[PDB]
Paper text:
The DNA damage response (DDR) protein DNA Polymerase θ (Polθ) is synthetic lethal with homologous recombination (HR) factors and is therefore a promising drug target in BRCA1/2 mutant cancers. Polθ is a unique DNA polymerase (Pol) and DNA helicase fusion protein that promotes multiple DNA repair mechanisms. The majority of Polθ’s DNA repair activities require it’s carboxy-terminal A-family DNA polymerase domain (Polθ-pol). For example, the DNA synthesis activity of Polθ is essential for its functions in MMEJ (TMEJ, Alt-EJ), translesion synthesis, and ssDNA gap repair.
A previously optimized highly soluble Polθ-pol construct (PolθΔL) was used for X-ray crystallography in which five short disordered loops were replaced with serine-glycine linkers. We conducted co-crystallization experiments using PolθΔL, along with RTX-152, DNA/DNA primer-template with a 5’ 10 nt ssDNA overhang, and incoming 2’,3’-dideoxyguanosine triphosphate (ddGTP). The structure of the resulting complex was determined to a resolution of 3.24 Å. The co-crystal structure of PolθΔL complexed with DNA/DNA, ddGTP, and RTx-152 shows the enzyme in the closed conformation with the inhibitor residing in an allosteric binding pocket located in the fingers domain of the polymerase. Within the binding pocket, RTx-152 forms hydrophobic contacts with many of the surrounding residues and a hydrogen bond with Y2420. Upon RTx-152 binding, Y2412 shifts its position to form pi stacking with the inhibitor, which in turn engages residues W2366 and M2402 to facilitate hydrophobic packing within the binding site. The pull of the N alpha helix towards the inhibitor brings E2365 closer to R2419, allowing for the formation of a salt bridge with a distance of 3.6 Å between the two residues. The salt bridge forms over the inhibitor and blocks its exit from the binding pocket. Intriguingly, the binding of RTx-152 to the closed conformation of PolθΔL appears to lock the enzyme into this state on the DNA/DNA, which likely prevents or slows the transition back to the open conformation which is required for subsequent nucleotide binding and addition cycles. This is due to the fact that the inhibitor occupies the same space as the N and O alpha helices during the open to closed conformation shift.
Numbering used by the authors: 1825 to 1860, 1894 to 1917, 1930, 1935 to 2145, 2171, 2175 to 2260, 2303 to 2510, 2527 to 2590
Write the structure that this text describes.
DNA sequence: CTCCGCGCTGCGA
DNA sequence: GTCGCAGCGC
C-alpha cells in the first residue's frame, strides 16, 4: 500500500490537513509500540484512510518546523466535530481507542463513530468475537494478503494497538486503517440492506460510547470494608468446617462430592432425593432434615464469595490519585447473543447478593454480609440506582397481551412472593429473599420453558406435581402461551427472531431433527424475543440519559476527562455500572436531585408500550446501603 | 447424547 | 493450555 508520511515535509503536511478537513468519513488506527527501556504502551502515531489503499501516517515522535504541539493542534482540529459537520470516524475497538487517545494525547473525540466489530455482532449476535483477520476474510478477502504479512491480526486487539508484534507501529496502523475503512464500507452496505444501519448508528454505537465513558470512570471500591467482610466470612468458614466435622464424626472434603455423598446418604441414612446426588437441589431439600446440608451450602456460598469475588477485586483495585479514592476499572462486553451488556476483569456484575451468617455460641449473632457495600461513591457523592420494575414481564405483556399478566402487573404485588405463597402455602408477607429468589427462578423458568422434571426437582416435589403446576400456569395465563406458539411459528417460517429494534437472532436449530435441538432452539427464541428487547430498552435509556446529562453541561463527561484536564469540583452524574435491568450512576451531592429526575424521565420515556414503564430510583452512600428516593 | 434463558470466573482433570 | 463443572449475578 501507499503509506504517506504526512509529517515529513511542511507543504505535504499542510496539504494533508487541507484534504482531511474536507472528508466526512475516514478510518483511524493508533500506532502503539514499546517503551524502548522496559515494555509498556507508547502512542508513536496514527493512521488515517479515507479511500483506497492509501494510509496517511501522522507521526507523533521529520520536518523540525512541525513541532509536536503544532501537530497536536492540527490533530485536535481535525478530530473534534463542529456544528453540523456530519463526520463519521471508523475505528476498530472504538472504546479502547477512545480511552487510549484521551489518556495519552489529551484528545476527546467528538465526531460520529462506527465500529466494525459492533456491525459484525449486529449482523449475527451468535457470531464469534470478530477479529481483524475474520472481518477481512468475511468482507474484504482480496486484501487478506496484506494481513498475511503478519499473524497479529488473529487477535481481538487492534493490529495497530498491538505493540507485541515485531512489525512497526506505522505499518500495522496503516494496514489497519485501510482494511477497517473498506471493510466498514462493506458492513455498512450489508446493514443498510437489512434495515439495521439505523440501530447501528443511533443505539449501538452511542451505547459503546457510554460504555467507554463508564470504563473511564470506574467503580469506587473500599478496601477496609472488604477486609472486615472477608475476616467475618473466613471466621464463619472455619466454624463451618469444625462444626461439620463434629456433625460427621470425621473429616470430609466439601469439594469431594463422593465424600459428602457417603456422609449424608450412607453414614447418616439421609433419604436420597437419580440417587446419591449431592447437587444443590437435593441439599436444599435435605436441609429440612439434618443441619449438615445447610452447613455445606453455607460453606460453598462463602467459599465462592471469598475466592471468586474478594480476591479478584482486591487484585484489580487501583488508586485514582486525583479523586483520593481506590477504584475498580472493569471492562465492558456487548458481544452477547441477546444484546445485554456484561463486564469482565473483574465481573462486578456477579457480586454476591446480601446474605447473613450467624456467629456465636448461644444461637449465634446475626451478621449481614453485603458485598455490594464495598462499592462507594467519591467523597461527598452518592450512588444512584434506577431499576426497571418488572421489565421483561412488561415486555411480555405488551407482546402476548395476556390480560391476566396485565392485571397482575396493574395490581402491584410481588408475583414471586405470590408463587411462593401458592408453593409453600404461606402468606406472601412471610416470603423471604431466599424463597422469593427461588420463586423468581421458578417464574422465569416456567415462562421460558422449564420442564416438569427440573421444576419438580427445584420445588422439592415430584414430577407429576410440577406438571400440574405447569398446566395451571398455562390455563391461567393463556395469551402468553398463544404468543409463544406464534413465536415458534414465526421463527420456523422465517428462521430467526426479531427484537423490538429489529435486531435478528438467527436460529436454524428450530428445524433440527433431534428433539432436544429443536426444544432448545424454541426456548432460545421465546427467551431472546424478550431479553434482547429488555437490553435494547436499557441501552436506549442509557444513551438518552447520557445525552440529557451532557445537555446541562457544567460537568465533565467522564472522570478520565476531568483528571486529564486537571493535569475543579466534581458536579454531575457518572456512569459506573449497568445491571441488566437497572442503571447505576455516581452523582455529586448538589445534583443528586437533578440527575435523578434525568434518569427517571428518560428510562420511563425510552420507548412507548401498551404498559407504562415503571422506574424505581434509590440513592445511597454505597451500592449496598441504598434507600428509596422521591424524584 | 439430551430439555427455562443470558452472562462470568476459579479450580480441576 | 483448554475446556468443563459448578459457584454466583441478572
Ligand atoms: C395465583 N398466582 C400466584 C402466582 N402466579 C403466577 C404468576 C405469574 C406471572 F408472572 F404471570 F404473573 C407466573 C407464574 C408462573 F407459573 F409462571 F410461575 C405464576 O405461578 C402460577 O401461576 N402457578 C400455577 C405456580 C405457582 C407456584 C409455583 F411454585 C409454580 C407455579 C399466579 O397466577
Ligand atoms: N430466564 C431468566 N431470566 C432471569 C433470571 N433471573 C433474572 N432474570 C432476568 C429477567 C428479569 C431480569 C431482572 O432480574 P432481577 O433478579 O433483578 O429480577 P426482577 O424480577 O426484574 O426484579 P427484583 O429486583 O424485584 O427481584 O433478569 C433467571 O433465573 N432466568
Ligand atoms: Mg429488577
Amino acid at each position: 500500500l501507499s503509506i504517506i508520511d504526512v509529517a515529513s515535509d511542511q507543504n505535504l503536511f499542510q496539504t494533508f490537513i487541507k484534504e482531511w478537513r474536507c472528508k466526512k468519513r475516514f478510518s483511524i488506527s493508533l500506532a502503539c509500540e514499546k517503551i524502548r527501556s522496559g515494555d509498556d504502551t507508547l502512542v508513536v502515531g496514527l493512521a488515517v484512510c479515507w479511500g483506497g489503499r492509501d494510509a496517511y501516517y501522522f507521526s507523533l515522535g521529520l520536518d523540525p518546523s512541525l513541532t509536536l504541539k503544532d501537530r497536536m493542534w492540527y490533530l485536535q482540529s481535525c478530530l473534534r466535530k463542529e456544528s453540523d459537520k456530519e463526520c463519521s470516524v471508523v475505528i476498530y475497538d472504538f472504546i479502547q481507542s477512545y480511552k487510549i487517545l484521551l489518556l495519552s494525547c489529551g484528545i476527546s473525540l467528538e465526531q460520529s463513530y462506527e465500529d466494525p466489530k459492533v456491525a459484525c455482532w449486529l449482523l449475527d449476535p451468535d457470531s464469534q468475537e470478530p477479529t481483524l483477520h475474520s472481518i477481512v476474510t468475511s468482507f474484504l478477502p482480496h486484501e487478506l494478503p496484506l494481513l498475511e504479512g503478519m499473524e497479529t491480526s488473529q487477535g481481538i486487539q487492534s493490529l495497530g494497538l498491538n505493540a507485541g508484534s515485531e512489525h512497526s507501529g506505522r505499518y500495522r496502523a496503516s494496514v489497519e486503517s485501510i482494511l477497517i475503512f473498506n471493510s466498514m464500507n462493506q458492513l455498512n452496505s450489508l446493514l443498510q440492506k437489512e434495515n439495521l444501519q439505523d440501530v447501528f448508528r443511533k443505539v449501538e454505537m452511542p451505547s459503546q460510547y457510554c460504555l467507554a465513558l463508564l470504563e473511564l470512570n470506574g467503580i469506587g471500591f473500599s478496601t477496609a470494608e472488604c477486609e472486615s467482610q472477608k475476616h467475618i466470612m473466613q471466621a464463619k468458614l472455619d466454624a463451618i468446617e469444625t462444626q461439620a466435622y463434629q456433625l460427621a464424626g470425621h473429616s470430609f472434603s466439601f469439594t469431594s462430592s463422593d465424600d459428602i455423598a457417603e456422609v449424608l446418604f450412607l453414614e447418616l441414612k439421609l433419604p436420597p432425593g437419580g440417587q446419591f446426588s449431592t447437587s444443590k437441589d437435593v441439599l436444599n431439600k435435605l436441609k429440612a432434615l439434618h443441619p449438615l446440608p445447610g452447613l455445606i451450602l453455607e460453606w460453598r456460598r462463602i467459599t465462592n464469595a471469598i475466592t471468586k469475588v474478594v480476591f479478584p477485586l482486591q487484585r484489580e483495585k487501583c488508586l485514582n490519585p486525583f479523586l483520593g479514592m481506590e477504584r475498580i476499572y472493569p471492562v465492558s462486553q456487548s458481544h452477547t447473543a441477546t444484546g445485554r451488556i456484561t463486564f469482565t476483569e473483574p465481573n462486578i456484575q456477579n457480586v454476591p447478593r446480601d446474605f447473613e451468617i450467624k456467629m456465636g455460641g448461644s444461637g449465634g449473632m446475626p451478621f449481614s454480609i453485603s458485598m455490594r457495600h464495598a462499592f462507594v461513591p467519591f467523597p461527598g457523592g452518592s450512588i444512584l440506582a434506577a431499576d426497571y420494575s418488572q421489565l421483561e414481564l412488561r415486555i411480555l405483556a405488551h407482546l402476548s397481551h395476556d390480560r391476566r399478566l396485565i392485571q397482575v402487573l396493574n395490581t402491584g404485588a410481588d408475583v414471586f412472593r405470590s408463587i411462593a405463597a401458592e408453593w409453600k402455602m404461606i402468606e406472601p408477607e412471610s416470603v423471604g429473599d431466599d424463597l422469593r429468589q427461588q420463586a423468581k427462578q421458578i417464574c422465569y423458568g416456567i415462562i421460558y420453558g422449564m420442564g416438569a422434571k427440573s421444576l419438580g426437582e427445584q420445588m422439592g416435589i415430584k414430577e407429576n406435581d410440577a406438571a400440574c403446576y405447569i398446566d395451571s400456569f398455562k390455563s391461567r395465563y393463556t395469551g402468553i402461551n398463544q404468543f409463544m406458539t406464534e413465536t415458534v411459528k414465526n421463527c420456523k417460517r422465517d428462521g430467526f427472531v426479531q427484537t423490538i429494534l429489529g435486531r435478528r437472532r438467527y436460529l436454524p436449530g428450530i428445524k433440527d431433527n433431534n428433539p432436544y435441538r429443536k426444544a432448545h432452539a424454541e426456548r432460545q427464541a421465546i427467551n431472546t424475543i424478550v431479553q434482547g428487547s429488555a437490553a435494547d430498552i436499557v441501552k436506549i435509556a442509557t444513551v438518552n440519559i447520557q445525552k440529557q446529562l451532557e445537555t446541562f453541561h457544567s460537568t465533565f463527561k467522564s472522570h478520565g476527562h476531568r483528571e486529564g484536564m486537571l493535569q475543579c469540583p466534581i458536579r454531575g452524574g457518572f456512569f459506573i455500572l449497568q445491571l441488566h435491568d437497572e442503571l447505576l450512576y455516581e452523582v455529586a451531592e448538589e445534583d443528586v436531585v437533578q440527575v435523578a429526575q434525568i434518569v427517571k424521565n428518560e428510562m420511563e420515556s425510552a420507548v412507548k408500550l401498551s404498559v407504562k414503564l415503571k422506574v424505581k430510583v434509590k440513592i445511597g452512600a454505597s451500592w449496598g446501603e441504598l434507600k428509596d428516593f422521591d424524584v
